[PDB]
């Protein structure tokens, strides 16, 4: 109702709106933890004799999209596991498509 912050009678219509729900942890199946398609500092596998590399990435390349598209065949990516978030970000079919 009114600006007064110390003490006032005019905080009678003052109600309660709860804060918007949001949770922060690892992106589904450990995605975005390390660099993929980023070769400023590359995932180089060399040798005590061997001079060579194992990462040759570019902006016109996908490695982030790989571990979900190929892994679609080996079971449905929904099963309950804690290490990798094996259950993947999925909207409710009841919420996005309204069942009015």
């Amino acid at each position: 109702p009114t600006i007064k912050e110390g003490n006032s009678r005019e905080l009678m219509g003052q109600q309660s709106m709860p804060n918007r729900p949001n949770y922060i942890a690892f992106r589904d199946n450990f995605i975005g933890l390390m660099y993929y398609n980023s070769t400023g500092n590359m995932g180089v596998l060399a040798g005590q004799a061997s001079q060579l590399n194992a990462v040759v990435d570019l902006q016109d390349r996908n490695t982030e999209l790989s571990y979900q598209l190929l892994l679609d065949s080996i079971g449905d990516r929904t099963r309950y596991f804690s290490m990798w978030n094996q259950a993947v970000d999925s909207y409710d079919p009841d919420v996005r498509i309204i069942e009015n």
Partner: peptide, 14 residues
Amino acid sequence: PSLGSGYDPYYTYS
């Protein structure tokens, strides 16, 4: 943004 590193000031969302 057009990503290829860690440090980027462009990324203001999550």
